[PDB]
Structures are given as structure tokens and as C-alpha cells.
Amino acid sequence: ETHESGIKPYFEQKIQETELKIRSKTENVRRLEAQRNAL
Amino acid sequence: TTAAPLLALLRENQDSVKTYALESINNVVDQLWSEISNELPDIEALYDDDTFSDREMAALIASKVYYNLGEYESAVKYALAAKDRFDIDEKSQFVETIVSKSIEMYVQEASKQYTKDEQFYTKDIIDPKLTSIFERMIEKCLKASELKLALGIALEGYRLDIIESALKSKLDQDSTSENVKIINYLLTLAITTVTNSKFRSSILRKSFDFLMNMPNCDYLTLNKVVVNLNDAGL
Amino acid sequence: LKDVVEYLDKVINKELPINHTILGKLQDVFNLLPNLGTPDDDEIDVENHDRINISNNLQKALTVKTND
Amino acid sequence: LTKSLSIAFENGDYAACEKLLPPIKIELIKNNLLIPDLSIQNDIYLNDLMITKRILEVGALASIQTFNFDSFENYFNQLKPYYFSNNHKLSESDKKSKLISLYLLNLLSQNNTTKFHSELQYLDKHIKNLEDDSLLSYPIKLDRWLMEGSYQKAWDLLQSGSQNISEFDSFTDILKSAIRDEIAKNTELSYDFLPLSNIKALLFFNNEKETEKFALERNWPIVNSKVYFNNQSKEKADYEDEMMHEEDQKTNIIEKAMDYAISIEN
Amino acid sequence: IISLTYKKISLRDICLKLNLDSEQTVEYMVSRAIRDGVIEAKINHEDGFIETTELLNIYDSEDPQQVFDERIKFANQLHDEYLVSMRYPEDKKTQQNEK
Amino acid sequence: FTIALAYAGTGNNSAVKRLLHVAVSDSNDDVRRAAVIALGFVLLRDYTTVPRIVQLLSKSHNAHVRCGTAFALGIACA
Amino acid sequence: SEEINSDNQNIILRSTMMKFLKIASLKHDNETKAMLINLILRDFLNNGEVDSASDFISKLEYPHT
Amino acid sequence: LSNVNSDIYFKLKKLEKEYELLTLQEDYIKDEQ
Numbered sequence: 001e002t003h004e005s006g007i008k009p010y011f012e013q014k015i016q017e018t019e020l021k022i023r024s025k026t027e028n029v030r031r032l033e034a035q036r037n038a039l
Numbered sequence: 040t041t042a043a044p045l046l047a048l049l050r051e052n053q054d055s056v057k058t059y060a061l062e063s064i065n066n067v068v069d070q071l072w073s074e075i076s077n078e079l080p081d082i083e084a085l086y087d088d089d090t091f092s093d094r095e096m097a098a099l100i101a102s103k104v105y106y107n108l109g110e111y112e113s114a115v116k117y118a119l120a121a122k123d124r125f126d127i128d129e130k131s132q133f134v135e136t137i138v139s140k141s142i143e144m145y146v147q148e149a150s151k152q153y154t155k156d157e158q159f160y161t162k163d164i165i166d167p168k169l170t171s172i173f174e175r176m177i178e179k180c181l182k183a184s185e186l187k188l189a190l191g192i193a194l195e196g197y198r199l200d201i202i203e204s205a206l207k208s209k210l211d212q213d214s215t216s217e218n219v220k221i222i223n224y225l226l227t228l229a230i231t232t233v234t235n236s237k238f239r240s241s242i243l244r245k246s247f248d249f250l251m252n253m254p255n256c257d258y259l260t261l262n263k264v265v266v267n268l269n270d271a272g273l
Numbered sequence: 274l275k276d277v278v279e280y281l282d283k284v285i286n287k288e289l290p291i292n293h294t295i296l297g298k299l300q301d302v303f304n305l306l307p308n309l310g311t312p313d314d315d316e317i318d319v320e321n322h323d324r325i326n327i328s329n330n331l332q333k334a335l336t337v338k339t340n341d
Numbered sequence: 342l343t344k345s346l347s348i349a350f351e352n353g354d355y356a357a358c359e360k361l362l363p364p365i366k367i368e369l370i371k372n373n374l375l376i377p378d379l380s381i382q383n384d385i386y387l388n389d390l391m392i393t394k395r396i397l398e399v400g401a402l403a404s405i406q407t408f409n410f411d412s413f414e415n416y417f418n419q420l421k422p423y424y425f426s427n428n429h430k431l432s433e434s435d436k437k438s439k440l441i442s443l444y445l446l447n448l449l450s451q452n453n454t455t456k457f458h459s460e461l462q463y464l465d466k467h468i469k470n471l472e473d474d475s476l477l478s479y480p481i482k483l484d485r486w487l488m489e490g491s492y493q494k495a496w497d498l499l500q501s502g503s504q505n506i507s508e509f510d511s512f513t514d515i516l517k518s519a520i521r522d523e524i525a526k527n528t529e530l531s532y533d534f535l536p537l538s539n540i541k542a543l544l545f546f547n548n549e550k551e552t553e554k555f556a557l558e559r560n561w562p563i564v565n566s567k568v569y570f571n572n573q574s575k576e577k578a579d580y581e582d583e584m585m586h587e588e589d590q591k592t593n594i595i596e597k598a599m600d601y602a603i604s605i606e607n
Numbered sequence: 608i609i610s611l612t613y614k615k616i617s618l619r620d621i622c623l624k625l626n627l628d629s630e631q632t633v634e635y636m637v638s639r640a641i642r643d644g645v646i647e648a649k650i651n652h653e654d655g656f657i658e659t660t661e662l663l664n665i666y667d668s669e670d671p672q673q674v675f676d677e678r679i680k681f682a683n684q685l686h687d688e689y690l691v692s693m694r695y696p697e698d699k700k701t702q703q704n705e706k
Numbered sequence: 707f708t709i710a711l712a713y714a715g716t717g718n719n720s721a722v723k724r725l726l727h728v729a730v731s732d733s734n735d736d737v738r739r740a741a742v743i744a745l746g747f748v749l750l751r752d753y754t755t756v757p758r759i760v761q762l763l764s765k766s767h768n769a770h771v772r773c774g775t776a777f778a779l780g781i782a783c784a
Numbered sequence: 785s786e787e788i789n790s791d792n793q794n795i796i797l798r799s800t801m802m803k804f805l806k807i808a809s810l811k812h813d814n815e816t817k818a819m820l821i822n823l824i825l826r827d828f829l830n831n832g833e834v835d836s837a838s839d840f841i842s843k844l845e846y847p848h849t
Numbered sequence: 850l851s852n853v854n855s856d857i858y859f860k861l862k863k864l865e866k867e868y869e870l871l872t873l874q875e876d877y878i879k880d881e882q
Binding site for chain 5: 531
Binding site for chain 6: 873876
């Protein structure tokens, strides 16, 4: 388990950036959806 | 204590003083880094020169500082310049920052030269260092014994060598089922993930032959390749 | 504008019969051409200053609407 | 060995002091490893701290009394952060006041007030009233007067500063030229033309020939005993105006108009 | 302050008011100041007075525009801040069941 | 429907942007209809996010667009 | 109370914040980044070091999110 | 800790194709709006 914890953060770095993007993405699409609806 | 003695010693012209200083700074480079950021262009100049014989160490210091600051891009280039003492980084808890970078850049570059020519290994466009990191990372996966880690990373980079070799070496049939299952996971991924014709087509065709060797193989698995590629001769 | 430039070359290179009417119009262009360094230009700048300010005040009022 | 260096200093032959220095730099590496870098502090390390100290201090002062720039910075660069404060037994000594005063004066002679303040900030906690001002007052008064912009008063302190010359002259001479230069820069705003008699008095020249010498050197022709600052000035201005940076810095009213419109239409 | 009240003011006057030591000393302090451009003055040595250069009519020059250009940008930056934050609670509610 | 049939099954991002772009921009009413039905083919095996897209397209004034919206959903999750 | 032991342990205290800040940038925690930066800027003024403080602010990773 | 790693390579890569498509949607409704 100890061996895997060392290399885990190397797997993680590319994936977490992808995650952080998703958070911004989700808020964006919905907000334009509201503008789109009202119009 | 402060970096002020340390800085002072670089400046001393005499060879042995500068060398001693490099060791001294190296100890506290991880502990303290914001104080010698100022004075980075000097550490860099020492790395340039080819009078020093701990020259490899001088670039290591520049690299270390740059990752702590958070300029990850500056870190990885300076590290890949020296081609030394990267072994320790891979195997550390703390610094997997520059390890991830070396792996990302490498997968991208490889795919780009893969589309132009199927052979791009032979070209010196791919640096030997870059290579060496990669197969060390295959080394970690297999000790932990989890082959999905090895297969996917390679897959991203259009690395034909690594993929072919993994499937061939799997053939031992310690359990028959286990062989199948790992191959089964690769094919589903390969339709979707890969989009370049040359890589995609080549790995499925190859997969059919490996499976076929086993007499206890599922012809369900073989059937799939044969429909996708739609080649009667198979 | 460019075509008027090449028309003048063609009078003196390719020998079109000189259409003096054209030349008459171009004299009126040089002559009724605003001249720079004139204090009229200074006046112009004042008018510009006012409208760019008024834009600024309208921009703020829209802030109050968006804020509600 | 180490004692040879100490007495070489007192004789005042410093040329030979440098010839011995590279062997001693080899031994100063060892000396650094004796000190723990104040991780653990006990009275074993304290003994080492005291003996390394004496070497640093006499060696620092030799570099100051030498006076050819090239060699002077290079020997000095290490010495300067070492000698200004690592002081043993938490950090007294009478030498502490004298060595600080000479470091701070260096920065005023490099004509960086910015750094003079930056270095001063560091010191402040450790000299609040411990030494208060002693010989320390010498860079402190000087700063005060240039900040006020009392050029007169400043010149006065330097001139009187010839009393106390002991190794301080290493700065005194630099500082003369510096006042004279500064004034020259300011009075270009004030007016363009000075009669010859005024150029000397303002810029604090003491020698008639030097006034007229300095006049020629900033490229001012004196013709028929009358200065004509008009020529070079005008030529200088023309070459400055042409440089390349320039399109984005200067801008344009239409450029601004175009940025506003497209904000709305996002 | 003394310069803003008294536009052309002999060097002699200034010293008398604020008890400055001498004409040579005050000249130099003033000289230092207008390099860094706070006083916005000029010394006329030859005529014995220091003359404030201010005259107004800076509305005619381009400087108000630079000022006002910024003020528009600040308002716009306000609007954006409003818009983004505003929608974040609404997501929660639409997703939650309501009566 | 050239795009739909060629680019079937695996979503393609190129194919999808193209379809939506045509539907918004191109005013005629049969043509607007053709792009919605067409999207259901490209995303036949990835019909998860499909109602969230066509959510917008239900509300369209056009009678034709609402028709092709009804069918596209039919086709995807048949 | 002033003591040299307090002083030895002070060097330990600086070094630990610097090692941890890199870990906490990668998780991009708005809370964590904020707390650490306020503490470090304060420590530096107390010891008077101009130079370190300017380098530390250049980055501006201090969130406002 | 092995589990975490294994899903990163396995399941999650297939869901990342999906998340590229939803980002396309954001672009799209700026044009539609």
C-alpha cells in the first residue's frame, strides 16, 4: 500500500487539474442556460 | 541559518569554496527556497560552465527551487537538462511534481512524431533521458502488480513497443481467465480512446494473434476484433 | 481613393486624353481640406472629452440596474 | 599560520595578505562545518564560533582598505554578509557598531537609498537601543540630509569627515563626486543657462579650472567666455523621441472606443 | 503650501516664515523636490524668485481621457462579479424538490 | 444526414458542433428539422446527456424543430 | 521569555510552512493557501528581511476566489 | 490506495470523453443565445 501511496500523487496531478476544470465548467453551462431561457 | 553566508561563498572565486557552497545550499534547498530565488541567474551560469565537476548538482538546485515556487514548467526543463539524480525524485513522497511533468510532455511529443512516421524511436528528437524515465515508470507498476496502470499510460502516447510486449509476456496461463480479462479491458478502451487510424488498427490486429495462441481462449474475444476491423482474411 | 491615384499615372504614362473635370474636383479636395495645427482641432478635442465622460456616467447607471 | 595573517594585518602590508588568502579560504570551508548553522547551540560550538569570527573581521576590513574595484568586489562579496552579523554569545561586541557603520556607508556610496532602507529594516529589531547610535550615527545623519534635500549641510558633514579618516576615506571621495553630480541633474529643470561663476558655486566645485573642465565634459561649448547649453540639449531630445516601444504605450482615442463596445456585446 | 499661496516668492521670504536657516539651503531642498515633481515649480536664480508653473487648462489636454477610460473598466468588472455569483444558489434550488 | 450516417456511433465532437451550428444558423424549417434527427445517430450509444441538449430545442417556436426533437429522442433510446 | 532554545526552534517553524505550501498548491485549496501566506508575510517583517518578502509576493497565488 | 489508482486509468478515462462533449455545449449556447 506504501509503495502505491508514493506514486499516487503522480497519477493524481493530471486528473485533479481535469477535475478543477469540470467545477468551473458546470457552473458556466448552467449560467448561460438561465440567460438563454429568459430570452 | 539565513542564506546570506551561502550566497557570499558562491562569489568567492576560488574553486573549492564554490563547490563546498553547492553542498551547503543543497541541504536547505527543500527547507528554504524563497531567499535564493533572487540569485537564480548565478546558479544557472555555474551549470552552463564545464569547469565544475559537480556541475550536475548545480542545475539540480535551480530545478528544486523552481518546483517549490510553483513554476513547474521551469523545474522540469532544468531537471531534464542535467540527466542526473532523477532516480531519487521518482521514489520520493514529496516531489512527484516533476515526475508527472516529465511523463506528460513525453506522451504528447511521442504521439506527434507517431502520426508523421511510425518510426520515431530511432530519431534523436526523442531524447534518451526521456525514454529512460518512461520504462522506469513501467518498472513501478509491475512491482505493485497492476497492469492497467502500465497499459493505459503507454496507450496515451502511441507507444507501439510497450503495448505489443505487454500482451505477449502475459501468456503463461497461470489462470486462463485472468489472461483474458485484462485483454478484454484493453480492447473496449482502444475503440474510443484512440482516433489515429495507424495506431488503432495496428494494435487490434496484433491482439487477435496473441489470443489465438491460447487453445483455451474465448472466441468471443477474437470475434470482436474480426467484426471491428472487418477483414475477411482474419 | 486608390483608383484616383492610378488614374493620374494613366494620364502621363498611357496618354488618356486629359479629363480636366476630374482635376477640378481634386483641387477642391486639397483646398477645402482641413489644415492641422489650426485651433479648430483644439475645439474638436473638447467635444470628444465631453462625450467620453457622458459614456462613463451612463456606464455607471447600468451598474445600478445590474446590481438590483 | 592563522597567526601569520593576523600580524600581517597590523604591519599594514596588505599585498602579501592576499597572497596568503587562498590557502586560508581552503581552511575557512572547514571552519564553516565546525559551526552547526545554529541548529544545536552549546558551548563546544561557541568556541568554534569565536575563533572563526576573528578571521572574518580582520579580512573584511583589509578588503575595504583596498581600492581597485575589480579585486575589491570579488574578495568582498562573501565577506559582506558574513562579517555584518554573525556575532557570538547572542550578539554583542564593540566591533558590531564599527563594522555596521562601514557596511551601510557602502550602500550610500553605491547610491542606492532603496537598499539603505531595506538593510536598515533588518537591523532595526537588533539595534533599537542596544547600541542606539554610536559610530552608526555617521551614515544616519548623512541620509537624513539628502532626504531633506539639504545639499549644503551634507557637503559640510563630509568636509568635517576628514577628521575621522581611518578607512572611512574609502567612501569619502566617492561621495564628493556624487553630490556634485546630483545637483547637476536637478538644475537642468530649473533653468538652461548659468553664467560661469554660478556653475561653480551651485554644484559645489572649489576650483575654477574644474568648473570649466566639468562644463566641457557634459558637452557645453564656451565661446567668447559664454556658455551655450542650447546645442547638445536639442540634439539629445531628437534622438530620444525615436525609440521603439511605442504604439501600445501611446494609444489612440479610437482604440479605447473599440474596447468598450465589445464588452457589451460579450 | 507656501508656493501654492505665493506663486512668485523670493527665497528670502520663505526662510523668514518658516525660520529656514539660509537662502542656499532652502534652494537646494526645493531643487530636490521638483526633480521628483511634487512642488511642480521652477527656480529662477538669475531673477530671485521661484515661480509655480501651474496654469490649469488640463481638460483641453488628453489627461482626462486616461482617467475616465479606467473608471469605465472598473464598472464593468462590477457587473461581471454580479453575474457569476448570482447563479450559484439557483442551481441548488432547481435541483432540490420543491412543494 | 450525410454527417449523421458517416460519423455514426462514437460521438465525434466535430460532427456534433457541426450539427448544432447548422440548426441555429440556417433558417429554413425542414433543414432545421434534419439536424435534430441527425444528432440522434451520432450519439446512439451515448444518449445520456442527450435530453439535456435537446431541452433547449423543445422550447423552439418552430413546429418543425419540436417534431424532429420528439423523433431524435425516439431514435437514441429506441 | 527570551531564550536560545526558542531561537533554534524558530528555524524549524519556517521550514515546515515552506514544505507544506507546495502540497497545498497542488490540491488548490483556497482555505489552505490563504492561511499559510498571511503567516509567512508576517514572520518575514518581524525578522526584517525585505528581500525574501518581495520574492514571496511576486507569485501572487493568494486566492480571492 | 491501489483502488484509487486503478479507477483513474480504467473507468474515468471513458467518462473524460463525455466531459469534453459537455464543454462543447457551453460554446454552443453562447452562439444560440
